[PDB]
Amino acid sequence: MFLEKINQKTGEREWVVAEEDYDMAQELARSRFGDMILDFDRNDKFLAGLKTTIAEKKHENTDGKVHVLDIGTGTGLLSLMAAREGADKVTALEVFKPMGDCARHITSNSPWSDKITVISERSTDVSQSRADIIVAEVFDTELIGEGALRTFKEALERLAKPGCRVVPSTGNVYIVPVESHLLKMFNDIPRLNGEKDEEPLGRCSGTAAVFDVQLSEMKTHEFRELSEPIVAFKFDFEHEEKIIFDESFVREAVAHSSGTIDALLMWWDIDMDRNGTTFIDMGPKWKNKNNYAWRDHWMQAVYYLPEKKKVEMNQTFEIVCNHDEFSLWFSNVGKDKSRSYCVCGLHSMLSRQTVYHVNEMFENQKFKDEVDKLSKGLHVATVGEGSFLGLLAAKTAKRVTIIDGNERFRDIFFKYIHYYKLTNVEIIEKVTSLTDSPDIVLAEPFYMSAMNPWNHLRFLYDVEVLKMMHGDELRVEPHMGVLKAIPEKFEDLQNIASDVGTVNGFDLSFFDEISTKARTATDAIVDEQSLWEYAGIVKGDAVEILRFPIDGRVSSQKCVVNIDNMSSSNAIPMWMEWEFGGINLSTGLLSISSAGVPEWNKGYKQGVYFPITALRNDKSLCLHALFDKSTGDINFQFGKS
Ligand SMILES: Nc1ncnc2c1ncn2[C@@H]1O[C@H](CSCC[C@H](N)C(=O)O)[C@@H](O)[C@H]1O
């Protein structure tokens, strides 16, 4: 139940929900699954699969009728598709109630009301005619992480006729081994002196959770394939005995080039009807010639072998491909075939992008030059949470005090101190335990706790506590920070937030209604996204929003600004920059090309606002921004002029 109210700043109408309804709504706010419904290719492929199987079943079984089951019906799209194009009957399940009513609602007010009936159970909990066809879009980037195996497997035994047909009928998962400095950087334990054999934290597989990334937006020069795609797994969705939760396979292939396997890229394809003619194929842009379509709710993934594996031109090599019910992982021959978890400690604290970020800074000569310059022969103190900056300062500083409140990072930092035998660094927990006045404070700033990637402003409070102790003249860097936005025309990104409307000639606008109400109730106004992964063209200069000078005091800060060039843009990115001594660190936009293509930092996610629909066509948008001394939070509202 959505409670209407009026934004007192922008006049727009918004909703809210009562605490008991919050979780329900949040879920329902995620029920769009980004661009899922606007993935016209995925739709045209389910349809086509439905045409074939409905026809062939019509033909086969004697009473020329056909009963289709839709698991995870969502808005009902897939049932509407089944009914139209022939299903005498369509029963359609959905574990999530509010999405149950949505699908009954839209499915009632329809030409196919007669044929379609919505049940709000999980497939795996049910007992009833038997189904002649099962249709289910119940996949994620890993293919199996959303329960698809059990879902088809069990539906097949209990819910469907023998000789059932299923849409999709079949799939493969492919891995491609690549050498890539880039990809390594997302997983590599930071090596302080740069050499290959440094292992200050011992060895680790890194994080086991999926690394989904848009590999289409990766630059050709950033990686080098060593071989042709390898089939890891084949799934057969029509035969329960072929669906198996825990599996392992050694796979073989012939390398077409020598190189080290820094990563294995993966994606899947599905055969919509078992004919070998109509596929959804998640191969990226650079290796997907007949069924490429941008989308975001599905993507490709990167995986890392636990140990180094080298491969040689024209020589055969093997990779062990493993899955349990929900996850895929890969390993080397003669090595433990179990799913591994970070044991190093670092993997499990830092995101992939932050791990990249730390390897980037460790390798950055220009940034390392300013640290050296600023640190020389001095006592420096570092603030941050999980920020390795202190360990650079150490190259040149007389003495470094790293202040980090998180016990787990201190242990990590103590391991770096031990492994490289650093003789000039101590670590303390609390800002107030810095009792020897340092010559300078250095920060990035980075706090792993930041609620939002554009907001590491705890730095500003830590600075004040150090000024209270040691005088307003305390030298600190960075000396100034600024929040910045820029109007951008994204190629496709915006489909994750824009209205869904009429799809394959079906009116889903009811779902836009409840989805928008849910979203206004639960979402942040400014999304977060790894913008290096999304293509587009910038439509104006970056504009300044809030600025945070460092010579105190900390102060709430207000900004109301017009953002122009929106009539041809479709999003507004936001990020932070800092003057660290004599250089500029950007957590976002790094450069813009002659043709207007922006480049973004891979080591952070950035903010993006997508114009609400009442605002889709305005030429300028009013952006109210607000930093609050009391919470350290920043709040945004976006309105008309
Ligand atoms: N075994 C199961 N039984 C019922 N619903 C399921 C399920 N597994 C997943 N779901 C639901 O299935 C949906 C997957 S999203 C796909 C929705 C819609 N069919 C479409 O194609 O656009 C989610 O709404 C989720 O809650």
Curated annotation (Swiss-Prot):
Lineage: Eukaryota, Metazoa, Ecdysozoa, Nematoda, Chromadorea
Enzyme Commission designation: 2.1.1.-
Similarity section: Belongs to the class I-like SAM-binding methyltransferase superfamily. Protein arginine N-methyltransferase family. PRMT7 subfamily.
Species: Caenorhabditis elegans
Domain spans labelled SAM-dependent MTase PRMT-type: 12-329, 334-641
Residues forming the catalytic site: 137, 146
PANTHER family named among the record's database cross-references: PROTEIN ARGININE N-METHYLTRANSFERASE (PTHR11006), PROTEIN ARGININE N-METHYLTRANSFERASE 7 (PTHR11006:SF4)
Listed name of the protein: Protein arginine N-methyltransferase 7
InterPro entries, A to Z: Arg_MeTrfase (IPR025799), MeTrfase_PRMT7 (IPR014644), PRMT_dom (IPR055135), SAM-dependent_MTases_sf (IPR029063)
UniProt KW keywords: Methyltransferase, Repeat, S-adenosyl-L-methionine, Transferase
GO BP, one annotated term: methylation
Entry-linked PROSITE patterns: SAM_MT_PRMT
Entry's Gene Ontology molecular function annotations: histone methyltransferase activity; protein-arginine N-methyltransferase activity
Function: Arginine methyltransferase that can both catalyze the formation of omega-N monomethylarginine (MMA) and symmetrical dimethylarginine (sDMA).
